[PDB]
Nucleic acid binder design. Structure first.
Ligand SMILES: [K+]
Ligand SMILES: [K+]
Ligand SMILES: [K+]
Ligand SMILES: [Mg+2]
Ligand SMILES: [Mg+2]
Ligand SMILES: [Mg+2]
Ligand SMILES: [Mg+2]
Ligand SMILES: [Mg+2]
Ligand SMILES: [Mg+2]
Ligand SMILES: [Mg+2]
Ligand SMILES: [Mg+2]
Ligand SMILES: [Mg+2]
Ligand SMILES: [Mg+2]
Ligand SMILES: [Mg+2]
Ligand SMILES: [Mg+2]
Ligand SMILES: [Mg+2]
Ligand SMILES: [Mg+2]
Ligand SMILES: [Mg+2]
Ligand SMILES: [Mg+2]
Lengths: 56, 94, 76, 135, 50
RNA sequence: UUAUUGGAGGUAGAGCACUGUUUGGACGAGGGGCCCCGGGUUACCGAAUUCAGACAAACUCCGAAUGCCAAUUAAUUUAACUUGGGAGUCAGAACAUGGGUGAUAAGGUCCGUGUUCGAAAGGGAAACAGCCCAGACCACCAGCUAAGGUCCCAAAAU
RNA sequence: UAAUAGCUCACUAGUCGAGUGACACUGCGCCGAAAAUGUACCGGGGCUAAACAUAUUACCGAAGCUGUGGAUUGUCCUUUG
RNA sequence: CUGGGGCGGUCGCCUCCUAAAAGGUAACGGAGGCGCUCAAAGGUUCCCUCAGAAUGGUUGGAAAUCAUUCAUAGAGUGUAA
RNA sequence: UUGGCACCUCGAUGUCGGCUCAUCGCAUCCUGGGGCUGUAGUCGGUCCCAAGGGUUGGGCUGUUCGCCCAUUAAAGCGGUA
RNA sequence: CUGGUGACUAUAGCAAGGAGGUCACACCUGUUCCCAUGCCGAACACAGAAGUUAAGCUCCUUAGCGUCGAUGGUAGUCGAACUUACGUUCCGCUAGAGUAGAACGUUGCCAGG
């Protein structure tokens, strides 16, 4: 289980990445979201890891 | 006709690049005996041994277990840079 | 100059993917010649289109290394 | 230096990024010339360089050019607004990427070879270096 | 019409560097070529006969 | 949207297995100029064969990553379609990338992809629509940071 | 020089009293470098670091985020908030 | 229509490439065809498998036709690719 | 310079030469300072520094250019819509 | 084991050498009627079994050609960070060629022994 913070904006980032952000549940910058460690969500990490900071 | 050797686990285009910058060449050893090993060897030692015992002389390779009798089936060499990039050691029959 | 023309494109290729459910008479793969052959419950039209004849499920397949085929298999 | 016949006289102009698909290891002769940089090379440059080497060396000597300009290139007529097709041919080019061997030379000593290929290097648009064979 | 656009002979620096009159001459060339179009039209309007 | 599975497709690369191009050799298949029916040649070599090295948008024995199409699957998300009322838009621009044209020129032109501008203010780039950071309901003599920076102009390390 | 001739270099021997060369890959830099109103491509002062590279710690810094209060429109709770 | 207009060229359809491995994708970007033909060159049933080279052989590239062997496709597929 | 682009200007940015008045650049025509010379000397060739000042009057042509007469230390190349 | 007949990407094939036969299959004897060849019983088809393993067929061995083919490394590349350099740096995938090597087929149903 882990929390996921959107530390870095989506202005200037493609719509793929923006979509993963919405799917994760991140809506503003420096917003956090707690989820489980599905590999389905590890892929959502890896698409946007440069936008994101994860903590466990 | 001797090379001391290290074994390498998995590698990337930064670990491998740092080795081959340091002057250590990657290689494999496969053939008649053991199954297969991925190794580091020293570029300078390898050069000296080949200038000594020929393009196809026989070599004793101290992988970390006992020495293995090998020869060079193929070498990937980098022109514009003048250094060896990968080596294939064919562990020969007896 | 002596050039500057080209014809309309014809929208060739696959039109229903593999592992997909398909009704009768459904186009699968428009083409020119047997780029892909038929298989089971598939017919080849005059212009070499490939159409299902029965409802079922699509599976593109092998027919010997330079030859594919396509089969619409029933389901239950 | 030209091809005798080609199917398409108006080609796209080639790619210049990357490195050699081949022609890197000196094969025929003893010494060679190796590009450190990328550019195009023409019939004209090749004739000049080859003349330079063959004059610097006596009749004792053997040269192997290792490139050929297959690819033509265009230039429009002068004082012409853009568009309206594609221009006629005015030359033929071999692309060169770093690594590739341009000239190889056999029948001499390394000093003579160095000076000849030095003289030739100044007649190409490319930085070169001098190569010997391998192991 | 082709002559209409090309510079004359022995026209020096100031006259050659003049560059404002290009449209004048281009329009004169269009006029003469329009006339060739008229004649070609007449030629087509001729009653062909075999 | 991702994970997984499957699938179509022939790109970058690479390669010469066909199509065309091409280097240097070994033979040659027999011609040609010239000498006297035949026989010669410091020569073209049309070719055939073969060894080695090379070229390709309209060559491919081969063949990626990506992207795409779906799934009796799982997770996260919150949109999608239909019917009707009402519109506006059909001059687009720069930047990055893949490519054409051009001169591997243009703040060039035309396409693909993406972002921004348009329609978007704020901080940096001296100033500077499109670059980088970032998306303003309002107030606050409160705080943490980004990009970018810390000698003075000019806030923060001489 | 007219050939001569003159004179040197190589090649060596003698003094010394420690280093001395030639090959290659690299980093940073040097000239190449001449334009028209006025220094005139660090923004300026000015800097031999106040530059460059590498590593680290602090900090400033937006109308971003947070804190506090207020308006509006929705959703969940909720009688009332 | 158009890298001003004009001349030149083009206007509809088909096939390649540009076209960036779905599809689609522009330019006065590059190469070519079409405005038909076939009562069989259609339908069906039976059977057959080519081109090219070497060799042998009259009128001789033995290229006409023949015989054999090789040859998996380089022939042919009415007609562009 | 001949060109490409077509970003500014279409509810107006007025052409060529000449006259008047200058100004900057230097890739220096002269004068100045030097190296080399295949510089004996006078004259020259060439190249480096140098932009302080100076740098002609007429004939033809609307002409700039150009040719010519006669001089001059020299009869400069260009930017400034 | 032989034969018939399907299935699998030639790992199955090509090539060379060798071997066997009246129980199969073959070649083989002839045109007798069915039937047939831009001409011939070569082929097709039929009445056959005197004859022969030569050939086709099948079996054994060999890795010369073909086919398949890792690991490792490389080119390339989605994405990200720097910068405009015919680019670099990090991650993930991942060739092609080749190298070692695999392989001179394996099964399924049926009739015979
Ligand atoms: K050069
Ligand atoms: K927007
Ligand atoms: K105007
Ligand atoms: Mg039809
Ligand atoms: Mg390619
Ligand atoms: Mg290609
Ligand atoms: Mg533009
Ligand atoms: Mg607008
Ligand atoms: Mg803004
Ligand atoms: Mg702070
Ligand atoms: Mg301060
Ligand atoms: Mg300090
Ligand atoms: Mg806010
Ligand atoms: Mg035009
Ligand atoms: Mg224009
Ligand atoms: Mg496509
Ligand atoms: Mg435009
Ligand atoms: Mg006004
Ligand atoms: Mg006067």
């Amino acid at each position: 289980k882990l929390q996921i913070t959107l530390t870095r904006s989506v202005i200037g980032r493609p719509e793929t990445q923006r979509k993963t952000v919405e799917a994760l549940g991140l809506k503003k910058t420096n917003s956090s979201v707690v989820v489980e460690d599905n590999p389905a969500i590890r892929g959502q990490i890896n698409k946007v890891k440069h936008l994101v900071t994860v903590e466990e | 006709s001797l090379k001391s050797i290290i074994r390498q686990g998995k590698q990337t285009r930064s670990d491998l690049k740092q080795l081959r910058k340091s002057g250590k060449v990657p290689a494999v050893v496969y053939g008649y005996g053991t199954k297969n090993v991925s190794v580091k060897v020293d570029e300078v030692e390898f050069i000296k041994v080949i200038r000594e015992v020929g393009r196809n002389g026989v070599i004793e390779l101290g992988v970390g277990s006992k020495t293995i009798k090998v020869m060079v089936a193929d070498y990937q060499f980098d022109p514009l840079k003048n250094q060896i990039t990968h080596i294939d050691f064919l562990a020969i029959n007896m | 100059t002596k050039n500057g023309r080209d014809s309309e494109s014809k929208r060739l290729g696959a039109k229903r993917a593999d592992g997909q459910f398909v009704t009768g008479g459904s186009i699968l793969y428009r083409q020119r010649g047997t780029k892909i052959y038929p298989g089971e419950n598939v017919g080849r039209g005059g212009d070499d289109t490939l159409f299902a004849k029965i409802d079922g499920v699509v599976k593109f397949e092998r027919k010997g290394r330079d030859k594919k085929q396509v089969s619409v298999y029933a389901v239950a | 230096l030209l091809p005798k016949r080609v199917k398409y006289r108006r080609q796209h102009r080639p790619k210049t990024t990357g490195r050699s698909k081949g022609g890197n290891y000196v094969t025929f002769g003893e010494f060679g010339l190796q590009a450190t940089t990328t550019s195009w090379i023409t019939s004209r440059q090749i004739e000049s360089a080859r003349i330079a080497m063959t004059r610097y060396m006596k009749r004792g000597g053997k040269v192997w050019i290792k490139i050929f300009p297959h690819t033509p290139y265009t230039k429009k007529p002068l004082e012409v607004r853009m568009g309206a097709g594609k221009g006629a041919v005015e030359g033929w080019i071999a692309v060169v990427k770093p690594g590739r061997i341009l000239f190889e030379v056999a029948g001499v000593s390394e000093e003579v070879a160095r000076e000849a290929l030095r003289l030739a290097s100044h007649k190409l648009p490319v930085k070169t270096k001098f190569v010997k064979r391998e192991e | 019409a082709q002559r209409a656009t090309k510079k004359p002979k022995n026209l020096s620096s100031s006259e050659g560097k003049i560059k404002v009159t290009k449209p004048y001459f281009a329009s004169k060339q269009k006029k003469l070529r329009k006339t060739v179009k008229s004649l070609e039209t007449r030629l087509e309007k001729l009653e062909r006969v075999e």
